[PDB]
Write a protein that binds this DNA or RNA. Structure first.
Ligand code: SF4
Ligand SMILES: [Zn+2]
Ligand SMILES: [Zn+2]
Ligand SMILES: [Zn+2]
Lengths: 675, 280
DNA sequence: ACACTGCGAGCTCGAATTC
DNA sequence: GAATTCGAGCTCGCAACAATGAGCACAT
């Protein structure tokens, strides 16, 4: 298939293209020739991945000097392995069309807990332990006595890698994570350091967000890699929350007393430099004194640095190198493990963050805890407000960066929060042989009672019954699977228990089994495998969960798993937390984003991500109800994206509960018939 | 052409059989088109059988044993119009009753099960996915006609054993789907014919005017004019060539050289099925 | 140093028959 | 020729708007 975009010869690996997907490549080419960024939106996960990789890999053949490297940032390791497998399918298609070989290599990067061959270090569970057991076996003082080549502890894979894994590069053959371990096994090299060394000479590179967005990581793996590259931020609808949590540290009493133990055990080792220990013993006193208060909550982001020099007389000039010297002091002390000193690095990272970054930050000390007047557990947050202090290296270093997802809800908020100017900012919509989605906003109840999940309309039984009368009357007309996202855990627990005291939960269990997703991982994955088995046989199940949970972001509901997706209210965050009430102050002065218009934008991107997790494919059909009256208004249903808004008519806009079933029953009858 | 068929018809008796979007009872619209289905089945199939099983409250009960009576099925469906229809049905129990007595038919037939299913949930005390490995071993061809939705286990049951699976648009679509099952898909039995009005030739067991088997000696008693209508497909008659006085109506076959007309050439080949000159 | 989305008011037409 | 009855559409004023929860991937 020699498909023709406006200047290229794109080798597509399929036979049928969709008419929206060909226009995706025209707008994607419009970014790269303009040497600028771009905010695109296209719903699916596959098909979008194979069309983006078809153009850019064909773009670097016609213009091999304008772009050279493609950096593909995905969310986590399952999608890292998925993108690489869609890349060799395009590469093998190039192997048939030309019959040749190529100087084309593509890698995938992850943590040391994924690329690991040595047996005594691989079965460690937590991620922060496998770095330490590595560091006891490969540090520059551990290899210092290996110049004699004795029987001291060493890693045989690292010491073999630097002797032979430099003169020859990786030839070809797009590598997964498992393929890199297989290459490292049969050759005898490290899989982790071969991937990091060969990342500078590659053509497609697929790692996570945190190798490029985290500022204390991207200067170690991606500083000198390419000045003319293309970055793709796949599935980056919550790209601002990654940018805030990367530059925000959280300190509590449980961490600070562990730093006293680290400062204790450093004092026993120097007697076996010393001014740095009295530096940290001074700083640990002041942060404990500020947490010692029981008063109102207060904020002071550069005024912390004045009071740190009043009682303690520490200026801000040595505080900038606080985390630097602690990385050097543990080197000259030659400490074995480094996971034990994790609180003292977290205090030293807090010290080097309040000294430099103070324009749009805050420090919130909260002695009065959540909902209780006296519980002795204070905590100070160093919370970042401005989400554009983490992409400002990324928006400047590279040539073009393309932020793509399926649910970028308004396309103009993302260039306003993140300080940049795109050149396209385009949206798209899938084309279908049917209408494979029937959204509806089930508003008022069966007796003209509002259904809303407000804060004052939660404890009245006229709404809890209308939620129970809805899930009952949709579990008799939907086949094989219903996912019912609630807004919280304390609301899901206080409604199923209030359906059991009434006579509503006994009538849902007659139709479908109900499985509950809980916070712990063992009971959730057990209740998720019995769900996917109860939809395969004829029983039919209901997985009722929360909206900002693990199942709503990880699990992909393919056809006949979750034919209906029931949103039991608009999934807001806690709108009265002191962290969020300070971030909206920064979002109101800077960028003039109204404080009500940001909570809806944040909620309509989680209510459209988990609803959009019900259609992945051409033959997948899926119901998606929105069981809240507040979804009907203009500033909320105008935010959900243009591929689930073009089918939401005005008849399906304030449907009652009983009328919402005869749109559910008529849609599922029409979809069950062949093309 | 077609072969013998031993077709069970499984009828749902769930709580959802009192639903609208049909004739005002969902069960009585099923039983109305089924009584039409039994009559049309025995006319395009002379020596076949029909069993009818129902499911109600996690249990299956055989309403009618597997016998080729074209009357005993219709008078039992007219009896079960006022069924109470409480509880959810089962699909493991119904395909176990329709397998413990469909495994023992001879191998030169086409054993089939037609499940008319209105409910969505099959609450059953065992696993279904070993029956479909067992039904595929016993060469049973299970086809489902569903109502109002598409269950996943009803597509696995249909496409692995070899049947079809369809969902109703309306009552006109429901009558069209049942008429696709009356046609047969493309050994020597021992019947006894029924001279003397309707008697029995093997043990003189007189009973009513039926093609049913003998209740005493176990011999099938068919009517020989019924089997005679299904001839003329084997050694059928050929067409004619054409280029006043006729031979059939008296006012061209290449076998006996007998001139016909246009009104006779349309009548011999379509309705008479035999050349009137060839019989001489 | 308050105030979003809905909704009946005038205003002016139309079709067809009236006064 | 100048009223009616009941319908339609477009401007525009009127009054009063809202926002509640919980955890493992990535650097020496
Ligand atoms: S140096 Fe290589 S073998 Fe040793 S822990 Fe790290 S990745 Fe594993
Ligand atoms: Zn007899
Ligand atoms: Zn004639
Ligand atoms: Zn003849």
């Amino acid at each position: 298939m020699k498909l023709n975009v406006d200047g290229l010869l794109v080798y597509f690996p399929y036979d049928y293209i969709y008419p929206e997907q060909f226009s995706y490549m025209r707008e994607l080419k419009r970014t790269l020739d303009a040497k600028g960024h771009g905010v695109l939106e296209m719903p699916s996960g596959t098909g979008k991945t194979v069309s983006l990789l078809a153009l850019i890999m064909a773009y670097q053949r016609a213009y091999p000097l304008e772009v050279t490297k493609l950096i593909y940032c995905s969310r986590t390791v399952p999608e890292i392995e998925k993108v690489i497998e869609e890349l060799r399918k395009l590469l093998n298609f190039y192997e048939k069309q030309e019959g040749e070989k190529l100087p084309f290599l593509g890698l995938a990067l992850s943590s040391r807990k994924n690329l690991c061959i040595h047996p005594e270090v691989t079965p460690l569970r937590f991620g922060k332990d496998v770095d330490g057991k590595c560091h006891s076996l490969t540090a520059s003082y551990v290899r210092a006595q290996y110049q004699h080549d004795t029987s001291l502890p060493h890693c045989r894979f690292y010491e073999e890698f630097d002797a032979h894994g430099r003169e020859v590069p990786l030839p070809a053959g797009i590598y997964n994570l498992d393929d890199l371990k297989a290459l490292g096994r049969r050759q005898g090299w490290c899989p982790y350091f071969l991937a990091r060394y060969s990342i500078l000479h590659a053509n497609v590179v697929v790692y996570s967000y945190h190798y490029l967005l985290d500022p204390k990581i991207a200067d170690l793996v991606s500083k000198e890699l390419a000045r003319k590259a293309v970055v793709v931020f796949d599935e980056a609808h919550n790209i601002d929350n990654v940018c805030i949590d990367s530059m925000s540290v959280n300190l509590t009493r449980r961490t600070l007393d562990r730093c006293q133990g680290n400062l204790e055990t450093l004092q026993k080792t120097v007697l076996r430099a010393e001014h740095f220990l009295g530096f940290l013993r001074r700083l640990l006193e002041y942060v404990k004194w500020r947490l010692r208060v029981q008063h109102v909550v207060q904020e002071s982001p550069p005024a912390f640095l004045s009071g740190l020099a009043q009682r303690v007389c520490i200026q801000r000039k040595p505080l900038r190198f606080c985390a630097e010297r602690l990385r050097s002091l543990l080197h000259t002390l030659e400490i074995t493990d480094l996971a034990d000193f994790s609180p003292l690095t977290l205090l030293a990272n807090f010290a080097t963050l309040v000294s430099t970054y103070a324009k749009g930050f805050t420090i919130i000390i909260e002695p009065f805890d959540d909902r209780t007047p006296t519980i002795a557990n204070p905590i100070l947050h160093f919370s970042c407000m401005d989400a554009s202090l983490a992409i400002k290296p990324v928006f400047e270093r590279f040539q073009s960066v393309i932020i793509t997802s399926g649910t970028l809800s308004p396309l103009d908020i993302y260039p306003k929060i993140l300080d940049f100017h795109p050149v396209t900012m385009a949206t798209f919509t899938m084309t279908l042989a049917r209408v494979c989605l029937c959204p509806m906003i089930i508003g008022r109840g069966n007796d003209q009672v509002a259904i809303s999940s407000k804060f004052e309309t939660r404890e009245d039984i006229a709404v809890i019954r209308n939620y129970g009368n809805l899930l009952l009357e949709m579990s008799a007309v939907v086949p094989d699977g219903i996912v019912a996202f609630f807004t919280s855990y304390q609301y899901m627990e206080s409604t199923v228990a209030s359906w059991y005291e009434q006579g509503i939960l006994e009538n849902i269990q007659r139709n479908k089994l109900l499985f509950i997703e809980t916070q712990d991982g063992a009971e959730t994955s057990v209740a998720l495998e019995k769900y996917q088995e109860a939809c395969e046989n004829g029983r039919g199940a209901i997985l009722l969960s929360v909206a900002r949970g693990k199942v709503s972001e990880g699990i992909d509901f393919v056809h006949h798993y979750g034919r209906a997706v029931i949103m039991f209210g608009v999934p807001y965050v806690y709108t009265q937390s002191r962290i969020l009430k300070a971030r909206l102050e920064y979002l109101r002065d800077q960028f003039q984003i109204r404080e009500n218009d940001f909570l809806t934008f944040d909620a309509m991107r989680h209510a459209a991500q988990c609803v959009g997790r019900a259609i992945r494919g051409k033959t997948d059909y899926g119901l998606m109800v929105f069981a809240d009256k507040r979804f009907a208004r203009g500033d909320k249903r105008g935010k959900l994206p243009r591929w689930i808004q073009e089918h939401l008519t005005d008849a399906n806009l304030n449907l009652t509960v009983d009328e919402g079933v005869q749109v559910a029953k008529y849609f599922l009858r029409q979809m069950a018939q062949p093309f | 052409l077609g072969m013998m068929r031993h077709l069970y018809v499984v009828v749902d008796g769930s709580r959802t059989m009192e639903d609208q979007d049909l004739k005002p009872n969902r069960l009585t619209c099923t039983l109305k088109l089924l009584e039409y289905f039994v009559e049309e089945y025995f006319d395009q199939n002379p020596i076949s059988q029909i069993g009818i099983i129902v499911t109600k409250s996690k249990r299956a009960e055989k309403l009618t044993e597997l016998s080729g009576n074209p009357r005993k099925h219709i008078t039992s469906l007219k009896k079960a119009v006022d069924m109470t229809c409480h509880g959810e049905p089962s699909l493991y129990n119904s395909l176990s009753i329709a397998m413990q007595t469909l495994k023992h038919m001879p191998g030169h037939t086409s054993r089939e099960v037609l499940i008319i299913f209105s409910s969505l949930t099959t609450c059953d005390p065992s696993n279904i996915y070993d029956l479909i490995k067992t039904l595929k071993a016993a060469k049973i061809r299970v086809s489902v006609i569903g109502l109002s939705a598409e269950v996943r286990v009803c597509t696995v049951l249909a496409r692995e054993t070899g049947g079809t699976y369809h969902v109703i648009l309306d009552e006109s679509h429901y009558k069209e789907l049942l008429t696709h099952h009356v046609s047969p898909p493309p050994g020597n039995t021992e019947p006894g014919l029924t001279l003397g009005g309707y008697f029995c030739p093997q043990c003189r067991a007189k009973y009513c005017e039926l093609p049913v088997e003998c209740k005493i000696c176990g011999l099938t008693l068919v009517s020989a004019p019924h089997l005679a209508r299904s001839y003329h497909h084997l050694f059928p008659l050929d067409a004619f060539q054409e280029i006043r006085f006729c031979y059939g109506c008296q006012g061209v076959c290449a076998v006996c050289q007998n001139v016909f007309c246009v009104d006779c050439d349309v009548f011999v080949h379509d309705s008479l099925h035999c050349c009137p000159g060839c019989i001489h």
